[PDB]
Amino acid sequence: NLLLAFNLQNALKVLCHPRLHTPAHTLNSLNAAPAPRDRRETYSLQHRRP
Amino acid sequence: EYRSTVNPWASQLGSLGDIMYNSSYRQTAVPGLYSPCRAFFNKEELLRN
């Protein structure tokens, strides 16, 4: 019944890992998805050089 | 598990809370008088068991 203190300092043992800053498995699981979205957007994706 | 110690003046290998109450630094001490902390920092008391 000790009053332990979980601040953000302990959560750095997880949050500061590169597995939380990669999109790679997220991206290929979206690429392996059987259904992508129908309502596509095109307005401000990539910049055309004039 | 979230912090080392609360008293960094009494819980190091040699410090204030050690030098008053280590028998390794109480060489010039008298052999008579009792103190409360002598069972709290004597290394031969905590390691013989």
PDB file of all heavy atoms in Angstrom, chain A residues 11-50:
ATOM      1  N   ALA A  11       6.992   6.413 -18.404  1.00  0.00           N
ATOM      2  CA  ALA A  11       6.482   6.095 -19.733  1.00  0.00           C
ATOM      3  C   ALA A  11       7.477   6.389 -20.847  1.00  0.00           C
ATOM      4  O   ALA A  11       7.195   6.080 -22.010  1.00  0.00           O
ATOM      5  CB  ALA A  11       5.184   6.858 -19.991  1.00  0.00           C
ATOM      6  N   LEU A  12       8.632   6.965 -20.530  1.00  0.00           N
ATOM      7  CA  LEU A  12       9.675   7.110 -21.529  1.00  0.00           C
ATOM      8  C   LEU A  12      10.329   5.786 -21.873  1.00  0.00           C
ATOM      9  O   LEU A  12      10.961   5.681 -22.927  1.00  0.00           O
ATOM     10  CB  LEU A  12      10.725   8.091 -21.036  1.00  0.00           C
ATOM     11  CG  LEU A  12      10.125   9.312 -20.357  1.00  0.00           C
ATOM     12  CD1 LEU A  12      11.222  10.122 -19.702  1.00  0.00           C
ATOM     13  CD2 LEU A  12       9.360  10.144 -21.375  1.00  0.00           C
ATOM     14  N   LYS A  13      10.171   4.764 -21.028  1.00  0.00           N
ATOM     15  CA  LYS A  13      10.687   3.440 -21.348  1.00  0.00           C
ATOM     16  C   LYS A  13       9.918   2.772 -22.477  1.00  0.00           C
ATOM     17  O   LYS A  13      10.358   1.734 -22.977  1.00  0.00           O
ATOM     18  CB  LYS A  13      10.653   2.549 -20.113  1.00  0.00           C
ATOM     19  CG  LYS A  13      11.864   2.682 -19.219  1.00  0.00           C
ATOM     20  CD  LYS A  13      12.200   1.352 -18.573  1.00  0.00           C
ATOM     21  CE  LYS A  13      13.531   1.401 -17.844  1.00  0.00           C
ATOM     22  NZ  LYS A  13      13.583   2.474 -16.817  1.00  0.00           N
ATOM     23  N   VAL A  14       8.778   3.326 -22.872  1.00  0.00           N
ATOM     24  CA  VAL A  14       8.024   2.848 -24.012  1.00  0.00           C
ATOM     25  C   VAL A  14       7.923   3.902 -25.104  1.00  0.00           C
ATOM     26  O   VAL A  14       8.185   3.613 -26.274  1.00  0.00           O
ATOM     27  CB  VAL A  14       6.627   2.385 -23.567  1.00  0.00           C
ATOM     28  CG1 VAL A  14       5.723   2.175 -24.764  1.00  0.00           C
ATOM     29  CG2 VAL A  14       6.752   1.118 -22.749  1.00  0.00           C
ATOM     30  N   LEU A  15       7.571   5.133 -24.738  1.00  0.00           N
ATOM     31  CA  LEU A  15       7.241   6.141 -25.734  1.00  0.00           C
ATOM     32  C   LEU A  15       8.444   6.615 -26.531  1.00  0.00           C
ATOM     33  O   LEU A  15       8.270   7.151 -27.629  1.00  0.00           O
ATOM     34  CB  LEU A  15       6.570   7.332 -25.065  1.00  0.00           C
ATOM     35  CG  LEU A  15       5.162   7.050 -24.570  1.00  0.00           C
ATOM     36  CD1 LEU A  15       4.600   8.256 -23.868  1.00  0.00           C
ATOM     37  CD2 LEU A  15       4.323   6.708 -25.754  1.00  0.00           C
ATOM     38  N   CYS A  16       9.655   6.418 -26.032  1.00  0.00           N
ATOM     39  CA  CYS A  16      10.838   6.854 -26.760  1.00  0.00           C
ATOM     40  C   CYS A  16      11.471   5.714 -27.535  1.00  0.00           C
ATOM     41  O   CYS A  16      12.693   5.633 -27.653  1.00  0.00           O
ATOM     42  CB  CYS A  16      11.835   7.488 -25.805  1.00  0.00           C
ATOM     43  SG  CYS A  16      11.042   8.587 -24.634  1.00  0.00           S
ATOM     44  N   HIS A  17      10.667   4.830 -28.071  1.00  0.00           N
ATOM     45  CA  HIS A  17      11.233   3.782 -28.890  1.00  0.00           C
ATOM     46  C   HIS A  17      10.901   4.011 -30.355  1.00  0.00           C
ATOM     47  O   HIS A  17       9.833   4.541 -30.667  1.00  0.00           O
ATOM     48  CB  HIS A  17      10.713   2.410 -28.469  1.00  0.00           C
ATOM     49  CG  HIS A  17      11.506   1.281 -29.029  1.00  0.00           C
ATOM     50  ND1 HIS A  17      11.177   0.658 -30.211  1.00  0.00           N
ATOM     51  CD2 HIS A  17      12.648   0.696 -28.599  1.00  0.00           C
ATOM     52  CE1 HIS A  17      12.064  -0.284 -30.469  1.00  0.00           C
ATOM     53  NE2 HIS A  17      12.966  -0.284 -29.504  1.00  0.00           N
ATOM     54  N   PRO A  18      11.796   3.632 -31.270  1.00  0.00           N
ATOM     55  CA  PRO A  18      11.525   3.821 -32.701  1.00  0.00           C
ATOM     56  C   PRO A  18      10.363   3.016 -33.246  1.00  0.00           C
ATOM     57  O   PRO A  18       9.898   3.326 -34.347  1.00  0.00           O
ATOM     58  CB  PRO A  18      12.836   3.386 -33.364  1.00  0.00           C
ATOM     59  CG  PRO A  18      13.628   2.728 -32.281  1.00  0.00           C
ATOM     60  CD  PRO A  18      13.228   3.418 -31.040  1.00  0.00           C
ATOM     61  N   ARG A  19       9.865   2.014 -32.532  1.00  0.00           N
ATOM     62  CA  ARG A  19       8.713   1.288 -33.042  1.00  0.00           C
ATOM     63  C   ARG A  19       7.443   2.121 -32.961  1.00  0.00           C
ATOM     64  O   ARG A  19       6.472   1.834 -33.666  1.00  0.00           O
ATOM     65  CB  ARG A  19       8.550  -0.022 -32.286  1.00  0.00           C
ATOM     66  CG  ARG A  19       9.506  -1.089 -32.756  1.00  0.00           C
ATOM     67  CD  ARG A  19       8.950  -1.825 -33.942  1.00  0.00           C
ATOM     68  NE  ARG A  19       7.821  -2.649 -33.547  1.00  0.00           N
ATOM     69  CZ  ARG A  19       7.334  -3.636 -34.284  1.00  0.00           C
ATOM     70  NH1 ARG A  19       7.887  -3.921 -35.453  1.00  0.00           N
ATOM     71  NH2 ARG A  19       6.302  -4.341 -33.851  1.00  0.00           N
ATOM     72  N   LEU A  20       7.429   3.148 -32.119  1.00  0.00           N
ATOM     73  CA  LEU A  20       6.302   4.060 -32.065  1.00  0.00           C
ATOM     74  C   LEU A  20       6.435   5.223 -33.028  1.00  0.00           C
ATOM     75  O   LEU A  20       5.499   6.016 -33.146  1.00  0.00           O
ATOM     76  CB  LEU A  20       6.127   4.593 -30.648  1.00  0.00           C
ATOM     77  CG  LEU A  20       5.678   3.525 -29.657  1.00  0.00           C
ATOM     78  CD1 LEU A  20       5.395   4.131 -28.302  1.00  0.00           C
ATOM     79  CD2 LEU A  20       4.449   2.817 -30.178  1.00  0.00           C
ATOM     80  N   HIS A  21       7.560   5.352 -33.714  1.00  0.00           N
ATOM     81  CA  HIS A  21       7.742   6.430 -34.666  1.00  0.00           C
ATOM     82  C   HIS A  21       7.949   5.928 -36.081  1.00  0.00           C
ATOM     83  O   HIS A  21       8.342   6.709 -36.951  1.00  0.00           O
ATOM     84  CB  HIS A  21       8.910   7.325 -34.244  1.00  0.00           C
ATOM     85  CG  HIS A  21       8.856   7.732 -32.806  1.00  0.00           C
ATOM     86  ND1 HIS A  21       7.687   8.108 -32.184  1.00  0.00           N
ATOM     87  CD2 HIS A  21       9.828   7.840 -31.871  1.00  0.00           C
ATOM     88  CE1 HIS A  21       7.938   8.421 -30.926  1.00  0.00           C
ATOM     89  NE2 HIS A  21       9.231   8.267 -30.710  1.00  0.00           N
ATOM     90  N   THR A  22       7.700   4.655 -36.334  1.00  0.00           N
ATOM     91  CA  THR A  22       7.662   4.154 -37.691  1.00  0.00           C
ATOM     92  C   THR A  22       6.220   4.054 -38.148  1.00  0.00           C
ATOM     93  O   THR A  22       5.340   3.749 -37.330  1.00  0.00           O
ATOM     94  CB  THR A  22       8.355   2.797 -37.805  1.00  0.00           C
ATOM     95  OG1 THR A  22       8.149   2.260 -39.120  1.00  0.00           O
ATOM     96  CG2 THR A  22       7.876   1.813 -36.745  1.00  0.00           C
ATOM     97  N   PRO A  23       5.911   4.368 -39.403  1.00  0.00           N
ATOM     98  CA  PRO A  23       4.601   4.038 -39.947  1.00  0.00           C
ATOM     99  C   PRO A  23       4.587   2.786 -40.805  1.00  0.00           C
ATOM    100  O   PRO A  23       3.567   2.522 -41.445  1.00  0.00           O
ATOM    101  CB  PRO A  23       4.295   5.275 -40.798  1.00  0.00           C
ATOM    102  CG  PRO A  23       5.636   5.657 -41.340  1.00  0.00           C
ATOM    103  CD  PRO A  23       6.697   5.154 -40.362  1.00  0.00           C
ATOM    104  N   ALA A  24       5.680   2.017 -40.818  1.00  0.00           N
ATOM    105  CA  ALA A  24       5.904   1.053 -41.891  1.00  0.00           C
ATOM    106  C   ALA A  24       4.928  -0.113 -41.828  1.00  0.00           C
ATOM    107  O   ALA A  24       4.316  -0.471 -42.844  1.00  0.00           O
ATOM    108  CB  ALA A  24       7.342   0.545 -41.843  1.00  0.00           C
ATOM    109  N   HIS A  25       4.758  -0.705 -40.648  1.00  0.00           N
ATOM    110  CA  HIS A  25       3.817  -1.808 -40.519  1.00  0.00           C
ATOM    111  C   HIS A  25       2.383  -1.316 -40.657  1.00  0.00           C
ATOM    112  O   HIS A  25       1.542  -2.008 -41.242  1.00  0.00           O
ATOM    113  CB  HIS A  25       4.038  -2.510 -39.189  1.00  0.00           C
ATOM    114  CG  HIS A  25       5.463  -2.878 -38.947  1.00  0.00           C
ATOM    115  ND1 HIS A  25       6.047  -4.000 -39.493  1.00  0.00           N
ATOM    116  CD2 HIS A  25       6.434  -2.248 -38.249  1.00  0.00           C
ATOM    117  CE1 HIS A  25       7.311  -4.058 -39.119  1.00  0.00           C
ATOM    118  NE2 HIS A  25       7.572  -3.007 -38.363  1.00  0.00           N
ATOM    119  N   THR A  26       2.108  -0.107 -40.151  1.00  0.00           N
ATOM    120  CA  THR A  26       0.824   0.548 -40.381  1.00  0.00           C
ATOM    121  C   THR A  26       0.559   0.723 -41.867  1.00  0.00           C
ATOM    122  O   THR A  26      -0.528   0.393 -42.360  1.00  0.00           O
ATOM    123  CB  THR A  26       0.798   1.899 -39.670  1.00  0.00           C
ATOM    124  OG1 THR A  26       0.713   1.684 -38.260  1.00  0.00           O
ATOM    125  CG2 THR A  26      -0.387   2.740 -40.110  1.00  0.00           C
ATOM    126  N   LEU A  27       1.571   1.164 -42.604  1.00  0.00           N
ATOM    127  CA  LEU A  27       1.375   1.436 -44.019  1.00  0.00           C
ATOM    128  C   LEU A  27       1.181   0.162 -44.824  1.00  0.00           C
ATOM    129  O   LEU A  27       0.312   0.118 -45.701  1.00  0.00           O
ATOM    130  CB  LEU A  27       2.537   2.252 -44.567  1.00  0.00           C
ATOM    131  CG  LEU A  27       2.230   3.744 -44.676  1.00  0.00           C
ATOM    132  CD1 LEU A  27       1.161   3.891 -45.691  1.00  0.00           C
ATOM    133  CD2 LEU A  27       1.745   4.388 -43.404  1.00  0.00           C
ATOM    134  N   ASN A  28       1.947  -0.894 -44.539  1.00  0.00           N
ATOM    135  CA  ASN A  28       1.737  -2.108 -45.321  1.00  0.00           C
ATOM    136  C   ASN A  28       0.497  -2.872 -44.886  1.00  0.00           C
ATOM    137  O   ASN A  28      -0.050  -3.634 -45.690  1.00  0.00           O
ATOM    138  CB  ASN A  28       2.959  -3.030 -45.282  1.00  0.00           C
ATOM    139  CG  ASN A  28       3.481  -3.257 -43.892  1.00  0.00           C
ATOM    140  OD1 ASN A  28       2.821  -3.866 -43.052  1.00  0.00           O
ATOM    141  ND2 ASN A  28       4.688  -2.777 -43.640  1.00  0.00           N
ATOM    142  N   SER A  29       0.026  -2.676 -43.651  1.00  0.00           N
ATOM    143  CA  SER A  29      -1.265  -3.240 -43.287  1.00  0.00           C
ATOM    144  C   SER A  29      -2.399  -2.477 -43.939  1.00  0.00           C
ATOM    145  O   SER A  29      -3.459  -3.049 -44.207  1.00  0.00           O
ATOM    146  CB  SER A  29      -1.435  -3.238 -41.779  1.00  0.00           C
ATOM    147  OG  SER A  29      -0.933  -2.038 -41.244  1.00  0.00           O
ATOM    148  N   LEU A  30      -2.204  -1.186 -44.192  1.00  0.00           N
ATOM    149  CA  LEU A  30      -3.168  -0.475 -45.016  1.00  0.00           C
ATOM    150  C   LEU A  30      -3.049  -0.894 -46.471  1.00  0.00           C
ATOM    151  O   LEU A  30      -4.029  -0.843 -47.221  1.00  0.00           O
ATOM    152  CB  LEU A  30      -2.983   1.027 -44.864  1.00  0.00           C
ATOM    153  CG  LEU A  30      -3.746   1.554 -43.654  1.00  0.00           C
ATOM    154  CD1 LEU A  30      -3.354   2.974 -43.362  1.00  0.00           C
ATOM    155  CD2 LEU A  30      -5.238   1.451 -43.879  1.00  0.00           C
ATOM    156  N   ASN A  31      -1.860  -1.314 -46.888  1.00  0.00           N
ATOM    157  CA  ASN A  31      -1.676  -1.808 -48.243  1.00  0.00           C
ATOM    158  C   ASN A  31      -2.166  -3.236 -48.410  1.00  0.00           C
ATOM    159  O   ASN A  31      -2.473  -3.644 -49.533  1.00  0.00           O
ATOM    160  CB  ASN A  31      -0.204  -1.720 -48.639  1.00  0.00           C
ATOM    161  CG  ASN A  31       0.252  -0.298 -48.825  1.00  0.00           C
ATOM    162  OD1 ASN A  31      -0.471   0.640 -48.494  1.00  0.00           O
ATOM    163  ND2 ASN A  31       1.453  -0.124 -49.358  1.00  0.00           N
ATOM    164  N   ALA A  32      -2.238  -4.003 -47.329  1.00  0.00           N
ATOM    165  CA  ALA A  32      -2.808  -5.339 -47.377  1.00  0.00           C
ATOM    166  C   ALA A  32      -4.289  -5.346 -47.045  1.00  0.00           C
ATOM    167  O   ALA A  32      -4.877  -6.424 -46.920  1.00  0.00           O
ATOM    168  CB  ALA A  32      -2.060  -6.273 -46.424  1.00  0.00           C
ATOM    169  N   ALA A  33      -4.895  -4.176 -46.891  1.00  0.00           N
ATOM    170  CA  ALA A  33      -6.307  -4.101 -46.553  1.00  0.00           C
ATOM    171  C   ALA A  33      -7.147  -4.480 -47.765  1.00  0.00           C
ATOM    172  O   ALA A  33      -6.796  -4.120 -48.893  1.00  0.00           O
ATOM    173  CB  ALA A  33      -6.671  -2.697 -46.080  1.00  0.00           C
ATOM    174  N   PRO A  34      -8.245  -5.214 -47.583  1.00  0.00           N
ATOM    175  CA  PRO A  34      -9.080  -5.567 -48.736  1.00  0.00           C
ATOM    176  C   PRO A  34      -9.966  -4.435 -49.208  1.00  0.00           C
ATOM    177  O   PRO A  34     -10.549  -4.541 -50.293  1.00  0.00           O
ATOM    178  CB  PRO A  34      -9.912  -6.741 -48.215  1.00  0.00           C
ATOM    179  CG  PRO A  34     -10.027  -6.475 -46.748  1.00  0.00           C
ATOM    180  CD  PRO A  34      -8.751  -5.795 -46.327  1.00  0.00           C
ATOM    181  N   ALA A  35     -10.096  -3.365 -48.434  1.00  0.00           N
ATOM    182  CA  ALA A  35     -10.962  -2.246 -48.798  1.00  0.00           C
ATOM    183  C   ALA A  35     -10.293  -0.919 -48.474  1.00  0.00           C
ATOM    184  O   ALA A  35     -10.134  -0.585 -47.286  1.00  0.00           O
ATOM    185  CB  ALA A  35     -12.303  -2.348 -48.072  1.00  0.00           C
ATOM    186  N   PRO A  36      -9.868  -0.147 -49.464  1.00  0.00           N
ATOM    187  CA  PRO A  36      -9.514   1.248 -49.195  1.00  0.00           C
ATOM    188  C   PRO A  36     -10.738   2.136 -49.319  1.00  0.00           C
ATOM    189  O   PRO A  36     -11.789   1.682 -49.780  1.00  0.00           O
ATOM    190  CB  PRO A  36      -8.467   1.554 -50.267  1.00  0.00           C
ATOM    191  CG  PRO A  36      -8.860   0.690 -51.403  1.00  0.00           C
ATOM    192  CD  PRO A  36      -9.509  -0.549 -50.832  1.00  0.00           C
ATOM    193  N   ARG A  37     -10.615   3.397 -48.919  1.00  0.00           N
ATOM    194  CA  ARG A  37     -11.758   4.295 -48.873  1.00  0.00           C
ATOM    195  C   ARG A  37     -12.165   4.733 -50.272  1.00  0.00           C
ATOM    196  O   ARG A  37     -11.331   4.828 -51.177  1.00  0.00           O
ATOM    197  CB  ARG A  37     -11.434   5.517 -48.019  1.00  0.00           C
ATOM    198  CG  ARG A  37     -12.646   6.234 -47.477  1.00  0.00           C
ATOM    199  CD  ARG A  37     -12.218   7.482 -46.762  1.00  0.00           C
ATOM    200  NE  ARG A  37     -11.409   8.321 -47.635  1.00  0.00           N
ATOM    201  CZ  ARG A  37     -10.811   9.441 -47.249  1.00  0.00           C
ATOM    202  NH1 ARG A  37     -10.937   9.869 -46.002  1.00  0.00           N
ATOM    203  NH2 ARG A  37     -10.095  10.139 -48.116  1.00  0.00           N
ATOM    204  N   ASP A  38     -13.462   4.988 -50.445  1.00  0.00           N
ATOM    205  CA  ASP A  38     -14.001   5.402 -51.733  1.00  0.00           C
ATOM    206  C   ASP A  38     -13.920   6.906 -51.958  1.00  0.00           C
ATOM    207  O   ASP A  38     -13.804   7.343 -53.107  1.00  0.00           O
ATOM    208  CB  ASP A  38     -15.453   4.947 -51.850  1.00  0.00           C
ATOM    209  CG  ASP A  38     -15.970   5.015 -53.266  1.00  0.00           C
ATOM    210  OD1 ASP A  38     -16.380   6.110 -53.702  1.00  0.00           O
ATOM    211  OD2 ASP A  38     -15.971   3.968 -53.943  1.00  0.00           O
ATOM    212  N   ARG A  39     -13.977   7.706 -50.895  1.00  0.00           N
ATOM    213  CA  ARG A  39     -14.037   9.160 -51.015  1.00  0.00           C
ATOM    214  C   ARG A  39     -12.615   9.712 -51.000  1.00  0.00           C
ATOM    215  O   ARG A  39     -12.083  10.110 -49.969  1.00  0.00           O
ATOM    216  CB  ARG A  39     -14.887   9.742 -49.893  1.00  0.00           C
ATOM    217  CG  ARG A  39     -15.396  11.143 -50.153  1.00  0.00           C
ATOM    218  CD  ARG A  39     -14.700  12.131 -49.255  1.00  0.00           C
ATOM    219  NE  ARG A  39     -14.541  11.586 -47.916  1.00  0.00           N
ATOM    220  CZ  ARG A  39     -13.679  12.051 -47.025  1.00  0.00           C
ATOM    221  NH1 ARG A  39     -12.893  13.072 -47.333  1.00  0.00           N
ATOM    222  NH2 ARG A  39     -13.597  11.491 -45.829  1.00  0.00           N
ATOM    223  N   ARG A  40     -12.001   9.746 -52.178  1.00  0.00           N
ATOM    224  CA  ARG A  40     -10.617  10.178 -52.280  1.00  0.00           C
ATOM    225  C   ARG A  40     -10.524  11.700 -52.315  1.00  0.00           C
ATOM    226  O   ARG A  40     -11.489  12.405 -52.611  1.00  0.00           O
ATOM    227  CB  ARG A  40      -9.956   9.571 -53.516  1.00  0.00           C
ATOM    228  CG  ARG A  40      -9.246   8.258 -53.233  1.00  0.00           C
ATOM    229  CD  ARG A  40     -10.207   7.092 -53.339  1.00  0.00           C
ATOM    230  NE  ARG A  40      -9.651   5.872 -52.767  1.00  0.00           N
ATOM    231  CZ  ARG A  40      -9.114   4.891 -53.479  1.00  0.00           C
ATOM    232  NH1 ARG A  40      -9.063   4.975 -54.800  1.00  0.00           N
ATOM    233  NH2 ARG A  40      -8.634   3.818 -52.871  1.00  0.00           N
ATOM    234  N   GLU A  41      -9.332  12.202 -51.998  1.00  0.00           N
ATOM    235  CA  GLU A  41      -9.044  13.628 -51.981  1.00  0.00           C
ATOM    236  C   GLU A  41      -7.801  13.893 -52.818  1.00  0.00           C
ATOM    237  O   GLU A  41      -6.939  13.020 -52.956  1.00  0.00           O
ATOM    238  CB  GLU A  41      -8.849  14.144 -50.548  1.00  0.00           C
ATOM    239  CG  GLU A  41      -7.488  13.877 -49.913  1.00  0.00           C
ATOM    240  CD  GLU A  41      -7.201  12.406 -49.686  1.00  0.00           C
ATOM    241  OE1 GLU A  41      -8.154  11.606 -49.575  1.00  0.00           O
ATOM    242  OE2 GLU A  41      -6.011  12.045 -49.621  1.00  0.00           O
ATOM    243  N   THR A  42      -7.734  15.083 -53.418  1.00  0.00           N
ATOM    244  CA  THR A  42      -6.633  15.413 -54.314  1.00  0.00           C
ATOM    245  C   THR A  42      -6.148  16.846 -54.189  1.00  0.00           C
ATOM    246  O   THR A  42      -5.311  17.263 -54.998  1.00  0.00           O
ATOM    247  CB  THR A  42      -7.027  15.194 -55.778  1.00  0.00           C
ATOM    248  OG1 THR A  42      -8.370  15.649 -55.983  1.00  0.00           O
ATOM    249  CG2 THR A  42      -6.883  13.741 -56.185  1.00  0.00           C
ATOM    250  N   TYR A  43      -6.637  17.615 -53.218  1.00  0.00           N
ATOM    251  CA  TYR A  43      -6.495  19.067 -53.305  1.00  0.00           C
ATOM    252  C   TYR A  43      -5.089  19.539 -52.935  1.00  0.00           C
ATOM    253  O   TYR A  43      -4.431  20.218 -53.726  1.00  0.00           O
ATOM    254  CB  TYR A  43      -7.560  19.751 -52.445  1.00  0.00           C
ATOM    255  CG  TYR A  43      -7.182  21.149 -52.053  1.00  0.00           C
ATOM    256  CD1 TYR A  43      -7.111  22.171 -52.994  1.00  0.00           C
ATOM    257  CD2 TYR A  43      -6.888  21.450 -50.735  1.00  0.00           C
ATOM    258  CE1 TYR A  43      -6.739  23.442 -52.624  1.00  0.00           C
ATOM    259  CE2 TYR A  43      -6.524  22.713 -50.356  1.00  0.00           C
ATOM    260  CZ  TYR A  43      -6.458  23.703 -51.298  1.00  0.00           C
ATOM    261  OH  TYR A  43      -6.092  24.953 -50.895  1.00  0.00           O
ATOM    262  N   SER A  44      -4.618  19.223 -51.735  1.00  0.00           N
ATOM    263  CA  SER A  44      -3.326  19.727 -51.283  1.00  0.00           C
ATOM    264  C   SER A  44      -2.380  18.610 -50.871  1.00  0.00           C
ATOM    265  O   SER A  44      -1.746  18.668 -49.818  1.00  0.00           O
ATOM    266  CB  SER A  44      -3.490  20.711 -50.140  1.00  0.00           C
ATOM    267  OG  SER A  44      -2.224  21.171 -49.716  1.00  0.00           O
ATOM    268  N   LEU A  45      -2.271  17.584 -51.705  1.00  0.00           N
ATOM    269  CA  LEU A  45      -1.384  16.473 -51.392  1.00  0.00           C
ATOM    270  C   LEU A  45       0.065  16.815 -51.710  1.00  0.00           C
ATOM    271  O   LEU A  45       0.911  16.897 -50.814  1.00  0.00           O
ATOM    272  CB  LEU A  45      -1.811  15.239 -52.177  1.00  0.00           C
ATOM    273  CG  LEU A  45      -2.686  14.228 -51.456  1.00  0.00           C
ATOM    274  CD1 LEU A  45      -4.056  14.798 -51.119  1.00  0.00           C
ATOM    275  CD2 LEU A  45      -2.802  12.994 -52.318  1.00  0.00           C
ATOM    276  N   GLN A  46       0.363  17.031 -52.983  1.00  0.00           N
ATOM    277  CA  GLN A  46       1.716  17.282 -53.433  1.00  0.00           C
ATOM    278  C   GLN A  46       1.779  18.640 -54.109  1.00  0.00           C
ATOM    279  O   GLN A  46       0.822  19.078 -54.754  1.00  0.00           O
ATOM    280  CB  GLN A  46       2.188  16.184 -54.388  1.00  0.00           C
ATOM    281  CG  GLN A  46       1.240  15.902 -55.548  1.00  0.00           C
ATOM    282  CD  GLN A  46       1.742  16.455 -56.872  1.00  0.00           C
ATOM    283  OE1 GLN A  46       2.947  16.534 -57.108  1.00  0.00           O
ATOM    284  NE2 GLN A  46       0.819  16.827 -57.745  1.00  0.00           N
ATOM    285  N   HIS A  47       2.913  19.308 -53.948  1.00  0.00           N
ATOM    286  CA  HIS A  47       3.098  20.644 -54.487  1.00  0.00           C
ATOM    287  C   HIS A  47       3.655  20.575 -55.900  1.00  0.00           C
ATOM    288  O   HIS A  47       4.720  19.993 -56.127  1.00  0.00           O
ATOM    289  CB  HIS A  47       4.041  21.451 -53.606  1.00  0.00           C
ATOM    290  CG  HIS A  47       4.546  22.695 -54.256  1.00  0.00           C
ATOM    291  ND1 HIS A  47       5.706  22.736 -54.997  1.00  0.00           N
ATOM    292  CD2 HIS A  47       4.039  23.947 -54.283  1.00  0.00           C
ATOM    293  CE1 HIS A  47       5.896  23.963 -55.445  1.00  0.00           C
ATOM    294  NE2 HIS A  47       4.898  24.717 -55.028  1.00  0.00           N
ATOM    295  N   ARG A  48       2.957  21.205 -56.835  1.00  0.00           N
ATOM    296  CA  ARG A  48       3.452  21.336 -58.195  1.00  0.00           C
ATOM    297  C   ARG A  48       4.381  22.534 -58.272  1.00  0.00           C
ATOM    298  O   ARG A  48       4.019  23.637 -57.853  1.00  0.00           O
ATOM    299  CB  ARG A  48       2.298  21.500 -59.184  1.00  0.00           C
ATOM    300  CG  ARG A  48       1.693  20.192 -59.627  1.00  0.00           C
ATOM    301  CD  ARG A  48       0.457  20.402 -60.477  1.00  0.00           C
ATOM    302  NE  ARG A  48      -0.204  19.130 -60.751  1.00  0.00           N
ATOM    303  CZ  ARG A  48      -1.510  18.990 -60.938  1.00  0.00           C
ATOM    304  NH1 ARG A  48      -2.306  20.047 -60.876  1.00  0.00           N
ATOM    305  NH2 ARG A  48      -2.022  17.791 -61.179  1.00  0.00           N
ATOM    306  N   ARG A  49       5.563  22.316 -58.785  1.00  0.00           N
ATOM    307  CA  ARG A  49       6.425  23.459 -59.018  1.00  0.00           C
ATOM    308  C   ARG A  49       5.945  24.212 -60.254  1.00  0.00           C
ATOM    309  O   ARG A  49       5.622  23.596 -61.271  1.00  0.00           O
ATOM    310  CB  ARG A  49       7.867  23.012 -59.203  1.00  0.00           C
ATOM    311  CG  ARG A  49       8.414  22.287 -58.003  1.00  0.00           C
ATOM    312  CD  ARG A  49       9.742  21.625 -58.294  1.00  0.00           C
ATOM    313  NE  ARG A  49      10.283  20.999 -57.093  1.00  0.00           N
ATOM    314  CZ  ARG A  49      11.377  20.249 -57.075  1.00  0.00           C
ATOM    315  NH1 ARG A  49      12.046  20.037 -58.198  1.00  0.00           N
ATOM    316  NH2 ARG A  49      11.803  19.712 -55.940  1.00  0.00           N
ATOM    317  N   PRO A  50       5.856  25.538 -60.184  1.00  0.00           N
ATOM    318  CA  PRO A  50       5.361  26.303 -61.335  1.00  0.00           C
ATOM    319  C   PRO A  50       6.455  26.509 -62.376  1.00  0.00           C
ATOM    320  O   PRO A  50       7.616  26.761 -62.040  1.00  0.00           O
ATOM    321  CB  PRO A  50       4.919  27.630 -60.714  1.00  0.00           C
ATOM    322  CG  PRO A  50       5.767  27.772 -59.502  1.00  0.00           C
ATOM    323  CD  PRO A  50       6.065  26.385 -58.999  1.00  0.00           C
TER     324      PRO A  50
END
